[PDB]
Design a protein around this nucleic acid. Structure first.
Ligand SMILES: [Mg+2]
Ligand SMILES: [Mg+2]
Ligand SMILES: [Mg+2]
Lengths: 243, 117, 76, 154, 43, 95
RNA sequence: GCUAAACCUAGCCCCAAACCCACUCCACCUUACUACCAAACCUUAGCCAAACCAUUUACAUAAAGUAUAGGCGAUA
RNA sequence: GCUACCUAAGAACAGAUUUAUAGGUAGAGGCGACAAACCUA
RNA sequence: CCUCCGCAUAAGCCUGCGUCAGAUCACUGACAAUUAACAGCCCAAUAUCUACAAUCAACCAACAAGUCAUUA
RNA sequence: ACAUCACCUCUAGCAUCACCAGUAUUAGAGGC
RNA sequence: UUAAUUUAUUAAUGCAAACACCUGCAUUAAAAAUUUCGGU
């Protein structure tokens, strides 16, 4: 026989089920939206409808999102939105030949940045395209403030963004101790990506890490029923005091 | 080439027999010379009281009446136990009522349990 | 050539992730659960001690803190 | 002994009752085994099970009192401390912790307990769901069709 | 011919549960037997 | 970087549909290599008495090697962002 | 005449609906069914059909089986 | 786990010997005094 | 009249010609067994010595170059 | 018929998982 | 295999890219991979 709800949302089904369904609504939104980033190799077409080349017919055409072949190690640093491409190719790029499976891997470089928001130097692998992205953002802190985490497409940079957001919404003196003037200047500079203190709770963590924050959050030593019955008897005594 | 039996004592070679055992609880420790020393500390200790003069016989006579199955409800027992102390104290800080912060110092703690059966 | 290969020696430590290197935020490691596992961040425990004093595993005190260790070693 | 009737006796009296029950039950076991050795009938066949039942009721009272103690003093639900988790067979279960000396940051055996499941448990888990559903629809069809034949009998 | 000269130590070695659970393909083997619903889930 | 494209032209998808592609659709044809493309200089405003490239307060487009590796890592120059542009204009007008 | 035959009814069948499974105490990843010391993701492949073989090839209703593509040869 | 080859660590009487036990080499393979032989009818 | 076997441990199997009754060259059900000194099951830290084979081990005679020790 | 001592030829100037814990009187591969 | 063809992969170069490492493009091999050894 047949299963009632569809398995195409079975995972999504569990997203509304139980203890994990007690997660923050902001976390639900951040795991719920699926906005797409600009591509690494899928150059965008012009507009909605355009004339056919060999037919001269006004046809609406879209562009294919090429899947980003992300090796695991590139998550350990702040790479760009680029990577490798696991596909195939023809010998002379000619479809009338016997094609073979092929790969397009990136050329990374181990560089370093020194964030004032972090107020520390982090050295990791990045891309020259990622270098250009940071330069166009003019600073790593502003870049962390700028792109979406879905646009980030990297775990380490997402973690760095989470830390930067926590520091910005915290405004603790430990960010710039014995230099509150520089702290205030940076806070004015970093006033753009201000977030609520509650927003730092599930900031950029894994879905498994979201379950982790839940179990670290929803758990507590259970209330004593000696204490509970004592409180109930106190309530009964207060009520009978009016009797 | 036989598998459907249980894994009790008799399976294979000498030491292969040696490790596992039936459902005992261990009592001692293994030290030099392959000599086991079993402390009186870790042993079972079954100290039953004296049975003389208890008038409750092992079976109960059928001439007695029947009652209602009153399960030991936690709120009911708690009320029955704490009613007089709270009634006097409110007419008069739960340490006077005996609320236990932790059972770390008691012989028979509950969470975890250290009593037996 | 130094004697002994490194193969049967102790395993080299894998790289600790930059999640532990976060300057502000303590990561949500494997502490709350009980699984040295892949689905979370690795718990990092401090140096704990066995408070109990028992014959079975009481290791010796260090041989610089020993009550009798003279600079003039005895030829025995 | 009736359970609530037995519930009115003291704890020392409870110990006395348990010991008397132990003696009578031992008498029962020896008598039955001897009856097998003599290959004859039993003199009081209901007596053994009755003593067993009374001992079980006394145990139920003892468990009720211990449960009232656990509920009052701390209130934890399962008397042994433990948890719900997932095992290497991929299913959801409740594992029991065990009282052991060394800690979970150094426990040489407990760390060997691979209690992690990567994505390679998907098709089997859904298949387990499938078998459960198959038995479910089977029993439902059997019951309702048996009901239809039953109504046909009237 | 007397080829099957089995031995219990090597039996629980090459057919046991720890070794059959050491690599995750064997875990899949355990699961395959489980959805097959046998009794001798290992050896 | 590098940009490629689907050589066998992909079937269209529509508005509320995903590109349920072909097993042939994985084979791309390489369009361009941005790593092999002509580089552009980086425009930034200096803050310190630099060498023959410029002086303090001088905004110029230098090579990325001297900018990132030498100027920006040493902090001798900062980015010529529009928020930094106001600060540079104020520094120039407060002379 | 014997062996034999024959007998309903166990429960399976598909659907309809509906989201389900996991704690008597215990033990259970070491030799699973024993109370105890210092580590994961890396493009499914291939035939078949071309009457042989090679590029190509699948693992609600309506436009429409038209526009796209084919050793422009089989079709999708 | 038979057998082929190897390791660990034992045994018998005269080596290119055999063998009690564990362990290792997985088919697109290993092994091979190469028999185009073996690796569970 | 046979016995180049036999008796033990080892491994390996798993109660498998023990007892009281059935009837299936003339197996089934119930009941009872094997009480360890042998063998496993082990060994509180940190450092530090551990060249002088064995062959009846004293000679001869070697090569395939040695199968076993603590101490602080 | 294959292995092989003997002999001949060829490659390799050297180290931490085999060769090898070795250094061309060495290591590997062919012929009779 | 010195039948044919490549070269997915290495190894070299050389050229790019970055200031010894990585990626891309050519050539060369080693090794592979795809396809042929007709009829009366
Ligand atoms: Mg054909
Ligand atoms: Mg073997
Ligand atoms: Mg003894």
């Amino acid at each position: 026989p047949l299963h009632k709800y569809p398995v195409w949302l079975w995972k999504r089904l569990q997203l509304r089920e139980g203890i994990c369904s007690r997660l923050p609504g902001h976390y639900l939104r951040s795991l719920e939206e699926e906005r797409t980033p600009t591509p690494v190799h899928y150059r965008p077409h012009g507009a909605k409808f355009k004339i056919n080349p060999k037919n001269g017919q006004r046809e609406r055409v879209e562009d294919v999102p090429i899947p980003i072949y992300f090796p695991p190690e590139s998550q350990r640093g702040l790479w760009g939105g680029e990577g490798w491409i696991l596909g195939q190719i023809y010998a002379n790029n000619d479809k009338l030949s016997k094609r073979l499976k092929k790969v397009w891997k990136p050329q990374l470089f181990e560089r370093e940045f020194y964030s004032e928001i972090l107020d520390k130097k982090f050295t990791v692998t990045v891309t020259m395209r990622t270098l250009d992205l940071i330069d166009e953002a003019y600073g790593l802190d502003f870049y962390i403030l700028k792109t979406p985490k879905e646009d980030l497409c990297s775990k380490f940079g997402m973690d760095l963004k989470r830390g930067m957001l926590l520091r910005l919404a915290r405004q603790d003196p430990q960010l710039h101790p014995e230099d509150p003037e520089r702290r205030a200047a940076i806070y004015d500079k970093y006033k753009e990506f201000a977030i609520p203190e509650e927003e730092a709770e599930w900031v950029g963590l894994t879905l498994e890490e979201a379950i982790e924050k839940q179990r670290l959050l929803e758990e507590k030593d259970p209330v004593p029923l000696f204490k509970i019955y004592v409180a109930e008897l106190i309530q009964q005594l207060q009520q009978q005091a009016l009797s | 080439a036989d598998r459907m039996s249980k894994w009790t004592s008799k399976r294979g070679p000498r030491s292969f027999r040696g490790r596992k055992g039936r459902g005992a609880k261990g009592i001692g420790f293994l030290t030099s010379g392959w000599r086991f020393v079993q402390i009186k500390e870790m042993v079972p200790e079954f100290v039953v009281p004296d049975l003389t003069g208890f008038k409750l016989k092992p079976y109960v006579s059928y001439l007695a009446p029947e009652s209602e199955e009153t399960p030991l409800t936690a709120a009911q027992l708690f009320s029955e136990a704490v009613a007089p102390a709270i009634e006097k104290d409110f007419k008069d800080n739960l340490e006077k009522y005996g609320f236990e912060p932790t059972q770390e110092g008691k012989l028979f703690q509950l969470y975890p349990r250290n009593f037996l059966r | 050539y130094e004697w002994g290969v490194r193969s049967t020696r102790k395993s080299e430590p894998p790289p600790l992730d930059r999640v532990y290197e976060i300057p502000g935020l303590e990561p949500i490691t494997f502490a709350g659960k009980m699984h040295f596992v892949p689905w979370l961040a690795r718990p990092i425990f401090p140096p704990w001690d066995r408070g109990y004093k028992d014959p079975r595993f009481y290791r010796s005190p260090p041989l610089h803190e020993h009550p009798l260790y003279k600079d003039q070693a005895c030829y025995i | 002994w009736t359970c609530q009737q037995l519930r009115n006796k003291s704890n020392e009296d409870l110990h006395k009752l348990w010991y008397v029950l132990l003696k009578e039950r031992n008498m029962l076991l020896t008598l039955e085994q001897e009856a097998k050795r003599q290959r004859l009938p039993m003199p009081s066949p209901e007596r053994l099970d009755k003593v067993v039942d009374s001992m079980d009721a006394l145990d139920k009272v003892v468990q009720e009192r211990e449960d009232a103690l656990r509920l009052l003093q701390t209130g934890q639900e399962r008397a042994r401390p433990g948890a719900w988790r997932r095992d290497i067979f991929g299913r959801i279960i409740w594992h029991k912790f065990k009282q052991w000396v060394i800690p979970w940051h150094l426990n040489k055996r407990y760390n060997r307990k691979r209690f992690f499941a990567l994505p390679y448990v998907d098709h089997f888990l859904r298949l387990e769901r499938e078998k459960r559903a198959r038995i479910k629809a089977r029993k439902e069809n059997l019951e309702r069709k048996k009901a239809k034949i039953l109504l046909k009998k009237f | 011919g007397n080829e099957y000269q089995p031995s219990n130590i090597k039996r629980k070695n090459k057919h046991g549960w720890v070794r059959r659970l050491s690599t995750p393909a064997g875990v899949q083997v355990i699961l395959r037997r489980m959805l097959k619903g046998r009794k001798s889930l290992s050896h | 970087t590098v940009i490629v494209e689907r050589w066998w032209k992909v079937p269209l998808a529509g508005e509320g549909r995903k590109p349920r592609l072909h097993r042939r659709h994985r084979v791309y044809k390489l369009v361009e290599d941005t790593k092999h493309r002509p580089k552009e200089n980086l425009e930034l405003i200096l803050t310190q008495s630099v060498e023959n490239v410029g002086v303090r307060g001088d905004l110029v487009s230098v090579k990325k090697s001297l900018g990132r590796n030498r100027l920006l890592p040493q902090g001798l120059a900062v980015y010529a962002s529009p928020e930094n542009k106001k600060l540079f204009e104020e520094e120039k007008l407060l002379r």
